Design a protein around this ligand. Structure first.
Ligand SMILES: Nc1ncnc2c1ncn2[C@@H]1O[C@H](COP(=O)(O)OP(=O)(O)OP(=O)(O)O)[C@@H](O)[C@H]1O
Ligand SMILES: Nc1ncnc2c1ncn2[C@@H]1O[C@H](COP(=O)(O)OP(=O)(O)OP(=O)(O)O)[C@@H](O)[C@H]1O
Ligand SMILES: Cc1cn([C@H]2C[C@H](O)[C@@H](COP(=O)(O)OP(=O)(O)O)O2)c(=O)[nH]c1=O
Ligand SMILES: Cc1cn([C@H]2C[C@H](O)[C@@H](COP(=O)(O)OP(=O)(O)O)O2)c(=O)[nH]c1=O
Lengths: 232, 232
């Protein structure tokens, strides 16, 4: 059993674990905390929907099944210590790296690699740093190739629903065959979603910058995507 | 005429400029300042020596000639807005990016790209950011290829003189033929040099962290390399 900031990971046998989504939200290196009743359920459901879409499109993911409510059954992987960020529209930390305004449409997607390390506060890295960390160029290239394919699929699917995929974060691990498998979660916690018409945030930015009601925003995402009201 | 933090750039015609090295030193985003009589002369002389060595090895540089003392004649270029850092041994900012100690010998060199932008304080970037900045992948790859070749040459040459090239920064621009040309300076200001036996700094780190006498350290570098005492 491993209890993280937003999810719990419970071993089953040797091949699989339980990913349980909690109601907890954190931001700014965990210096901002709150709980949102039903956030876990929403993030679980939405992950399932995204993983199923991606699987239909030939993306290898850790998704195996659901275990009732906020719990997914997933394949255990040897995790890469990376957060892989894909960006279509300028927002968040990109504003400190490029002198471009919020909402600027990028000429092509940006991929950023962040080294998962709490003591160093998850610094950005490049391919050379990754190699020193034991991640080969070949591996990095496959990882970015998948992230960019995931981007296209989610972007297209979401645009047909009036949602702009601004940016998002993925994580990856290796399976026993040494294949690169998409892992962790895909939710309004780990993506920026803007309404196409109004350009307002329907994601964790609502909590990060106090823009209104997180649950309302997450429900709206769930409703726009499924065409149904969240039953919980 | 452009007066920078450590050097002055004076136009000649349309093809060339004067690079004048000043006695000024700055560090920590220019929050630490001092002047060292003779530093300009040392950095000029050492740049000349490095540019000549690199030219003999088939590296295209902006070096044209000397204009007496602290002044070099160099080719005017369309500058890339980059600082290109090559690292052999862990030091400086790399310690905040990888959990490795000062002096750790890297399994292979690291290349880091920093976007030259004072308002953003020169953030690290990757190939994708560079593209948005108008620098093609092809260009980035040629730039890194040159930096890594420069590394090998300087590393080998300096090791034969009992000096460890820990890391260093280069800058590049395009000439009228669209060729990538090595620019700016190569000095104890822009490199880490450690004595092979004692591992002590013979570079700007002496000023950054008050490790003794900058001029003495820079003289020692000049003496170890030329086999002669600095005449000024
Ligand atoms: N298929 C998988 N196999 C093994 N581990 C996984 C898998 N998917 C996700 N994980 C890891 O399980 C954890 C999920 O919990 P959570 O999101 O709360 O992480 P955290 O503890 O907050 O932060 P971190 O784990 O990044 O330090 C993360 O460490 C994630 O990388
Ligand atoms: N061959 C060249 N052609 C045109 N410009 C050059 C050439 N070589 C160096 N430069 C530029 O000239 C300037 C040298 O002066 P200096 O080192 O004092 O820069 P700075 O003003 O302190 O900092 P920066 O210029 O990076 O903001 C730098 O801007 C450098 O990029
Ligand atoms: C680096 C990182 C990004 N992300 C997601 C949130 C955003 O949708 C996108 C880019 O985030 P970014 O703008 O880099 O950081 P911040 O969340 O501090 O503004 O990736 C995470 O969920 N976790 C992370 O650790
Ligand atoms: C980024 C940068 C590096 N360098 C040189 C100094 C070091 O020899 C090497 C790596 O520096 P780095 O460790 O990144 O930064 P700091 O100088 O703040 O410790 O590159 C510069 O001269 N100017 C620069 O703007």
């Amino acid at each position: 059993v491993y209890e993280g900031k937003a999810k719990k990971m419970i071993p089953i046998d040797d091949d699989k674990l339980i990913m349980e989504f909690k109601d907890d939200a954190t931001a700014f290196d965990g210096t901002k905390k709150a709980r949102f009743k039903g956030k876990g359920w929403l993030n679980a459901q939405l992950s399932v929907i995204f993983f199923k879409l991606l699987e239909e499109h030939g993306i290898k993911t850790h998704f195996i099944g659901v275990a009732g409510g906020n719990r997914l059954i997933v394949e255990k992987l040897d995790m890469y210590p990376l957060e892989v960020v894909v960006r279509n529209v300028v927002a968040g930390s990109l504003k400190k790296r490029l002198p471009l305004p919020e909402g600027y449409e990028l000429p092509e997607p940006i991929v950023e690699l962040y080294y998962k390390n709490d003591e160093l506060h998850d610094p950005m890295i490049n391919y050379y740093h990754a190699k020193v960390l034991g991640i080969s160029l070949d591996e990095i290239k496959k990882i970015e190739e998948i992230a960019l394919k995931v981007n296209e699929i989610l972007k297209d699917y979401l645009a047909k629903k009036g949602i702009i995929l601004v940016d998002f974060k993925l994580e990856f691990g290796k399976d026993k065959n040494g294949d690169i498998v998409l892992a962790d979660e895909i939710s309004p916690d780990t993506c920026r979603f803007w309404d196409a018409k109004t350009k307002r945030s329907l994601d964790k930015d609502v909590f990060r910058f106090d823009k209104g009601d997180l649950i309302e925003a997450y429900k709206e995402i769930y409703e726009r995507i499924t065409g149904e009201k969240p039953e919980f």
